[PDB]
Amino acid sequence: RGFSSNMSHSGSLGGFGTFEFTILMAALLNGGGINSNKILLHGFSSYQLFKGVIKYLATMDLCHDGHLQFHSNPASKYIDEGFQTPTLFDKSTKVNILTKMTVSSYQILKEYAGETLRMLNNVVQDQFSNIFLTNISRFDNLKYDLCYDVQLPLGKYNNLETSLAATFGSMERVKFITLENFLAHKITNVARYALGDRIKYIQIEMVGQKSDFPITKRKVYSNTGGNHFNFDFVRVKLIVNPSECDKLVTKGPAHSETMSTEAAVFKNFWGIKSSLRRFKDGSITHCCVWSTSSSEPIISSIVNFALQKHVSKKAQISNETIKKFHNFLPLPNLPSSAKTSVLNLSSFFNLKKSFDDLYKIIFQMKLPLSVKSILPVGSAFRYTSLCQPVPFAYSDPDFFQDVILEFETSPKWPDEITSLEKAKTAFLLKIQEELSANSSTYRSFFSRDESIPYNLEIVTLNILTPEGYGFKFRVLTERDEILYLRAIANARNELKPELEATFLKFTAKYLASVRHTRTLENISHSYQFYSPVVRLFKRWLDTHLLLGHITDELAELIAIKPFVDPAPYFIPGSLENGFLKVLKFISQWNWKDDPLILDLVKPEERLTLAQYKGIQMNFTNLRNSDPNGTHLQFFVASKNDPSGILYSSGIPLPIATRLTALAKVAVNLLQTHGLNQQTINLLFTPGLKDYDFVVDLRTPIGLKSSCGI
Amino acid sequence: KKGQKKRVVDPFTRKEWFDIKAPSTFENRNVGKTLVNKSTGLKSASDALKGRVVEVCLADLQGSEDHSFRKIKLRVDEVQGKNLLTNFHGMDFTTDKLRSMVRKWQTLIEANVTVKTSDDYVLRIFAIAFTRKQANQVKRHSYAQSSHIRAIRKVISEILTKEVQGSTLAQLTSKLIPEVINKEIENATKDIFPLQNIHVRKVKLLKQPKFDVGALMALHGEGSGEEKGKKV
Amino acid sequence: ESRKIMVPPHRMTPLRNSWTKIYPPLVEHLKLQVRMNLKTKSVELRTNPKGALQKGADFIKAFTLGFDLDDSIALLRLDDLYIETFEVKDTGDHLSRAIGRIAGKDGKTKFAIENATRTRIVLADSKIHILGGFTHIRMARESVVSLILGSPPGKVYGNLRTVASRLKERY
Amino acid sequence: QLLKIFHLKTGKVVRSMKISSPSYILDADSTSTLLAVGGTDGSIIVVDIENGYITHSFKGHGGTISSLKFYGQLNSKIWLLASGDTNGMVKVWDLVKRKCLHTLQEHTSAVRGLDIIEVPPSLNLLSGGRDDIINLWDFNMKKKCKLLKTLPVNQQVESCGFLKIIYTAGGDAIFQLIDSESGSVLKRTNKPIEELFIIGVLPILSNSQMFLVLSDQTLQLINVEEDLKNTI
Amino acid sequence: SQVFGVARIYASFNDTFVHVTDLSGKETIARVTGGMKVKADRDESSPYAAMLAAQDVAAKCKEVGITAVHVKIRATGGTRTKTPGPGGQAALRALARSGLRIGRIEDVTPVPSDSTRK
Amino acid sequence: LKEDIHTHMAIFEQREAQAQEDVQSSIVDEDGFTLVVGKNTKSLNSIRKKILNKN
Amino acid sequence: DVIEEALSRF
RNA sequence: AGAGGUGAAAUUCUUGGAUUUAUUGAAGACUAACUACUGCGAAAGCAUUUGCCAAGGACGUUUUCAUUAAUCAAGAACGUAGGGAUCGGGUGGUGUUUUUUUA
């Protein structure tokens, strides 16, 4: 976790360490409770000692309310207040052993206690390598969510007074060791007050720091890029509550007539920008407008002002990765779309409104056999499509979303499979006939579909909605499932697995696809960065040329895997942290001894021990029948598909090995060269490789104004 | 009478009007208005109302008198600038419809399944199906054999616990608005008995997952607070 | 703005009798573009392309209540009156002799009500319609509900003397 | 039904009218002969008082109508009307052209206590409300703008400014005199220990003295002309 | 474009409650009974007393601004007479005729479903 | 495709009704053996395959 | 009525 | 500012807000409408769903045994013919509801 016992007062993640761990274990030996109830006995070994330790650290605060007391010369209890710093009192010394690290470092360590406690107390699966044997401290943006680098060219210790706007006082040099110390404590307090309910946790870490200075020299005598203090530039690492990133108004206290001290310090901290406003509720409250841009998250703008207003007036901020991929996101032709966020879903809601008026006008009419239910299954209906869907945007091949519709269980149906799918075409003929009869402002046509093999006579009904959208309609019946099963049963015995593959494609296209889009569309409103991480993953995967084999639901499942199981990390509060968590995981991931079980559940209906063991057992016999992954490479199993072979089927071994190799090359580049603009451009290079074949294709028109990006 | 009666409280100048907005499963999402209190300190009347039920009629939701009965219940659980964006909380027939349906020389089948949906909403959803006099039937009764009762109740409990456990609350409300699972019950149990009008008559909630204001906003539509021209 | 007014089939034929003497005292004077929907038994009064709609509406509303044309022109003139309906509800014993105590004989007690409190009342077999001044309607309804609650006709005649003096003498 | 009483010995009803909706607002002009009635519907009728007749209809308004104001001194020329609603809007009206001038949609609660004045035309108006905006607008003949709102802590019920220039704020058993182009209440009365509050300010002898009515049915004299020069 | 309360008329015997509450049913507006419009302890459930009780309820309801009513009539129900009394239809009819729109008439008498008598 | 699936349904229902009528008209064997048949079954191939699946 | 002949039998 | 309760009264409670209204929670009792000249049980009695435990009736039967039956002391456990319907089972008919290779 990166917690060595050096110091976090000097601006580095650490301070807590191994003998502090010893001291709290032996302090919890003789009690721990408020009545000194024995937290730790040596009746249980290191595993339950460790579990009780993490339980006590996660359920017993030290910073702000309560901390441990003990005296070595002798019970140990839990006193009630907190000293606004990590604290535990040892009265036989009168010392505060946890005052080597700071408030945010203790805060993030209590979070790590809670998180590893959550993934340790469960009796479901085993994750010992997930909890120990992966050094999460290797990368910055992997254990953190986003990063800023403050470059402060202060010049000299005397040039301070016109190069930086911070304090310079006896009262700060008496409590802070040096320049990096007072700027560190000032910058963590102004980041805390600037964001507050805008981020999960802040960690400050001055890089270029070193505890190294030679024999001949009196000090660190080092030109640290515009100063001579032991740090080069300031890592400002943020992990964010992702539900309030792009909320464009933060709120101070309201307006009394007597302008009290909280509104006072709010107006001092925010200067000319923030003011008191009316709202639709009618409250008169202190706030400030944050002009949201697409490429820029407003978290960078608020930290830019909280840097360039208080600690310096000419220092500058380095964060270019977010804007570097945010134009790799495709920007749709929408009104003020540059000022729209990436966490805005107004395009998907616009087609959902168009779909709902279509839904009403297809329910309010008369068939010879009424509608049981229609259910959209589209990638836009699960927030995944690469165009953020603008009306009239034909050039995207998934412009036409697909909606399954099923009538009621009439036992009048034709028998053989071509006849029943032709009867479904007959129903679609009737529905578009009445559609053009009554509401001719919608238009329509028919298109053959061959995404299922060997059924030659299956068409879909495509409609063009005058709000400007296009929907496929595929009729499902209660009969096609048992028709495919009895076709399986009476087929010739050397022709079984191909018809089984046909039925698997049918199940993936019609049946399990509905609960698929239902579950992850329901969970995307709890994991808010899901649609941007899948959209950037899919554009990465098409630049590296895999979508012609892999399916989009499989790419969607590989991208939900770091969200519904993010342990040991956080859920990703930013797009970069999501994307490199994806690629780090799939570079880690094997196939031969590695399935992929995920439960698409809400945080804090799940997958229990029995279903887990059944999934692992059919995986086990599946790939002892399959020796090394000759034709079955991945295994993605959810609650909605305990088979796991539904989306992984069909992809060739060169494509799957190319994906895993590209992931390992990407994590190699990440740990070697670091993040940069040319790093991200090399991460989106085609990797064309000149493997035997290159064609260059250009249709006689350009199609981005027509696709709407 | 004998006490002292605190003559004047004038309790409408301090009272405030909100209005409620249904989810987009319906179409006439505006429903009505509601008194609360002055939104002030020590009470927080903006959040003192955020669990209230409302009981509308589905004819007044859908603009079609064909389902004049079936008064449903919405639940305010948030505030967004005087607009209470509500969500589903239940469903119930009027007493008029069930008393007009129940009549003798026929028998009725009850069913009710408690069931968690694909979300964490557990419901218990009810069902009434009456026994139909067959066309050409000359005898008086048309009762059920009382062992066809059990097979009917078994398959009606089975197919409505297949409609739930699957089909999340948006899909559930959108599938019990246009009376389609009644027709499902009819088309799957016209084998055993003819079964004139089948209905669901009641959906009760029992537990809810959490607030989830993202999905609660996605049920209605997008809109956020912004600035106002202060000029001071 | 427009207004529909439903009409029942027990004032329909006298409306056809007096149909020639309502719209010539209306359309040239209180314009109100008029149709008469016999298809659904309503009367349509829509606005003028060249607040009289309320006056025409309660004009024919007093007519379908069943008051005289003199009273309906007395509603066009004197724009301060009020129409009012209430039905008894307070089967034979509590219907027949009760409306008998209302009417007295030949409408003489109803005539005493009317000439005492300056209103104009009419009544069907069960309902009561009273129009005129507001305090007069209050007082006349009070006397009528007294004598259907049960009071001697001489005692409500004394109450009629007091209320007639009060509402035909000033202050 | 409205009644006018010739205030002499013959206090007979000179004219009664029957209005559309029950009414809680009448405004008179600075002289006599001009009276404006506002119902619980948005219908603002203006009536002559010499011989009683409706003289201005003014039907096209939004909600139930809260307080409204005339304009015009003795032998003026404009003869305007304020007409502020409950839902927030104020539609200013003139009778000399039988017409509207502007429409204002800046409040949220019931617009109460509004008044117009000019200084050389300017014709700026104040318009308070049950919220805590005070809401002056520039209000030219053809164009439109808005000045500061000064944002009290109060529940403004029927407060009219435009003194010699200080502005009144009443309705929480508190009389504030907010200042021009600033927010500084300098005249703030002693709020009583009970909560019963001011319903009505009343100018006496052309804004010289002042009556405050109270919700326990009392009335107080203020002497704002002396207290403007005087110091609570 | 009207605005709706609900009526919640309780047509018990020996009394008659009418209080139009808000649409949720929580903030009640202008409760009157049938016992505070006449004072004799006998006629306090009369149709006339109930209808004039309804008249001044409609007065204060139009004062607040509610212009239309979903009406819910309630008998004494439960283990008792289960029929609406004399004043229910009277108060409903008076609220109808006194300038107040009425929609969705409904009977919310509490059916026992095998309560206790044994 | 209107007339195409019109002709397809018009031959399918013809051969279907022919098959079902041939099923439950009368089946005596070469000797006397009346074949047991369902109330609403449709094909000799259907009863053949279900008597195969009940092996 | 070609589409009605196609949608017989139901 | 009244509300249970009354034949009125009386009495009861109510400004420490009752009655009524809305949202929940607990408790045990009970299975309304469906309910009939219908069902079951030796009788008294017996109506929510599901599961389990056994029992019983009638019907079906080209199954078996061969008078094993009948009636109460004593004692034992429980508190005249005919006709129209209708319930339970069976057989046959051949039209509609039904359906079709999952049972």
Which DSSP string do the residues of E28-40 spell out, in sequence order? B---EESSSS--S
- Report, in ranges, which bases of strand H sit under 7 Å from a protein C-beta: 1-10, 14-17, 19-24, 28-36, 48-51, 85-89, 95-103
Question: Distance between CA E88 and CA E74 in Å, rounded?
Answer: 8
**Residue A617 contacts by C-beta under 8 Å, 6 or more apart in sequence?**
none
How many Å apart are B118 CA and H98 C1'?
A: 35
Beta carbons of B109 and B152 less than 8 angstroms apart: yes
Note whether E63 contacts D22, CB cutoff 8 Å. Answer: yes
Which other chains touch chain A, taking contact as 3+ CB pairs less than 8 Å apart? B, D, F, G
Phi and psi, residue C119, nearest 5°: -85, -170
The helix, strand and coil proportions of chain C, stated in percent and rounded to the nearest 5, come to 45, 20, 35
With an 8 Å CB cutoff and a minimum of 3 pairs, decide whether chains C and B touch.
Answer: no
Q: Closest residue by Cα to the C1' atom of nucleotide H95?
A: B136
Q: Closest CB to A525: pick one of B178, B188, B218.
A: B218
Question: Is residue D214 packed enough to be buried (19+ CB in 10 Å), middle (13-18) or exposed (0-12)?
Answer: middle
Resolution (Å units): 3.8
Nearest to B18 by CA among B41, B40, B44, B46: B46
Note whether B34 contacts E64, CB cutoff 8 Å. Answer: no
How many Å apart are A241 CA and H78 C1'?
A: 75
Nearest nucleotide by C1' position to the E114 CA atom: H32
Chosen from A419, A429, A475 to mutate, greatest number of chain F CBs within 10 A: A419
**Tokens at A553, concatenated:** 């639901």
Q: Which E residues 58-77 touch D at CB under 8 Å? A: 59, 62-63, 65
Q: Supply the range of the domain harboring residue E56.
A: 1-118
Closest residue of E to C90, CA-based?
E47
C86 touches chain E (CB under 8 A): yes
Mention the CATH class of domain A1-139. Answer: mainly alpha
Phi and psi, residue E86, nearest 5°: -75, -35
Question: Distance between CA D69 and CA D71 in Å, rounded?
Answer: 7
How many Å apart are B138 CA and H42 C1'?
A: 38
Chain G hits for A429, Cβ within 8 Å: 3, 6
Q: Closest CB to B232: pick one of D130, D151, D215.
A: D151
Chain F hits for G6, Cβ within 8 Å: 2, 5-6, 9
State the nearest Cα–Cα gap between E27 and chain B, in angstroms: 6
- Rounded to 5°, angle at Cα A129 from A584 and A40: 135
Nearest nucleotide by C1' position to the E76 CA atom: H20
Q: Closest CB to G10: pick one of A412, A429, A433.
A: A412
Q: How far apart are the first and last CA of chain F?
A: 43
Nearest to D175 by CA among D109, D227, D116: D227
Closest residue of F to G2, CA-based?
F6
How do D124-127 and D25-28 pair as beta strands?
unpaired
**Domain count of the fold of chain E:** 1
Note whether F13 contacts G5, CB cutoff 8 Å. Answer: no
Beta carbons of D145 and D108 less than 8 angstroms apart: no
Note whether D108 contacts A257, CB cutoff 8 Å. Answer: no
Chain C hits for D20, Cβ within 8 Å: 51, 54
State the nearest Cα–Cα gap between A285 and chain D, in angstroms: 11
Note whether G10 contacts A433, CB cutoff 8 Å. Answer: no
- DSSP H helices in chain E: 47-64, 87-97
Amino acid letter for position E102: I
Amino acid letter for position A438: N
Q: How far apart are the first and last CA of chain C?
A: 40
Residue A91 in 3-state DSSP? coil
Q: Which long-range CB contacts under 8 A does C73-80 form with residues at least 24 apart?
A: C73/C25, C75/C131, C76/C25, C76/C30, C79/C55, C79/D17, C79/D18, C80/C133, C80/D1, C80/D16, C80/D17, C80/D18
A256 touches chain D (CB under 8 A): yes
Chosen from E24, E26, E60, E109 to mutate, greatest number of chain B CBs within 10 A: E24
**Residue E43 contacts by C-beta under 8 Å, 6 or more apart in sequence?**
E49
Beta carbons of E4 and E103 less than 8 angstroms apart: yes
Beta carbons of E34 and E45 less than 8 angstroms apart: yes
Question: Is residue A461 packed enough to be buried (19+ CB in 10 Å), middle (13-18) or exposed (0-12)?
Answer: buried
Nearest to A195 by CA among A268, A94, A301: A301
CATH number of the domain that residue E56 is part of? 3.30.420.80
Q: What angle do helix axes A417-438 and A480-490 make, rounded to 10 degrees?
A: 160
How do A636-637 and A596-597 pair as beta strands?
parallel
Q: Is the CATH code 3.30.70.3020 the one for domain A140-248+292-318?
A: yes
After which residue numbers is chain A interrupted with C–N beyond 2.5 angstroms?
73, 604
Beta carbons of A407 and A372 less than 8 angstroms apart: yes
Q: Which B residues 124-163 touch A at CB under 8 Å? A: none
CA-based Rg of chain D, rounded to a whole angstrom?
A: 18
Q: What angle do helix axes A530-543 and A512-524 make, rounded to 10 degrees?
A: 120
Question: Distance between CA A485 and CA F49 in Å, rounded?
Answer: 14
Q: Closest CB to A429: pick one of F2, F42, F53.
A: F2
What is the SS3 string spanning D114-131?
EEEECCCCCCEEEECCCC
Residue D93 in 3-state DSSP? strand
Question: Distance between CA C43 and CA A533 in Å, rounded?
Answer: 66
Number of other residues whose CB lies within 10 A of the CB of residue A592 = 9
Question: Is residue A211 packed enough to be buried (19+ CB in 10 Å), middle (13-18) or exposed (0-12)?
Answer: exposed
Handedness of CA A259, A265, A266, A271 (dihedral sign): positive
Question: Distance between CA A506 and CA A487 in Å, rounded?
Answer: 13
Number of other residues whose CB lies within 10 A of the CB of residue E94 = 24
Query: DSSP letters along A648-707, please?
Result: STT--HHHHHHHHHHHHHHHHHHHHH-S-HHHHHHHTS---TT-S-------SS--HHHH
**Residue C89 contacts by C-beta under 8 Å, 6 or more apart in sequence?**
E47, E86, E89, E90
Question: Distance between CA B57 and CA E35 in Å, rounded?
Answer: 32
Nearest to D210 by CA among D167, D146, D153: D167
How many Å apart are B28 CA and H52 C1'?
A: 51
Residue E94 in 3-state DSSP? helix
Handedness of CA A665, A666, A667, A668 (dihedral sign): positive
Phi and psi, residue A389, nearest 5°: -65, 110
**Tokens at F54, concatenated:** 């009940």
Bridge partners, residue A405, by sequence: A374, A475
According to the entry, how was the structure determined? cryo-EM
D22 touches chain E (CB under 8 A): yes
**Residue C11 contacts by C-beta under 8 Å, 6 or more apart in sequence?**
C63, C64, C66
Question: Distance between CA C137 and CA C118 in Å, rounded?
Answer: 9
Amino acid letter for position B175: K
Any idea of the CA torsion for E74, E79, E81, E86, to the nearest 10 degrees? -30
Chosen from C1, C58, C87 to mutate, greatest number of chain E CBs within 10 A: C87
CA-based Rg of chain G, rounded to a whole angstrom?
A: 5
- Which runs of E-coded beta strand occur in C55-95? 82-87
